[PDB]
Amino acid sequence: FAADAWAAQDMAXGNPLTTXFCCXVQCG
């Protein structure tokens, strides 16, 4: 419900290395 993770939250994910960091972090 609501999905769309979060605005700005998954933005620092796609950051240097944050990538995978925010992939599993935001993954359900």
| 3 close to 9: Cβ distance less than 8 angstroms | no
Instruction: Take residue 15 and report the two structure tokens written for it.
Output: 């950051």
Which amino acid makes up residue 7? A
Contacts for 16 with CB less than 8 Å, ≥ 6 apart: none
Which amino acid makes up residue 21? F
DSSP label of 25:
H
Burial class (CB in 10 A: 0-12, 13-18, 19+), 21: middle
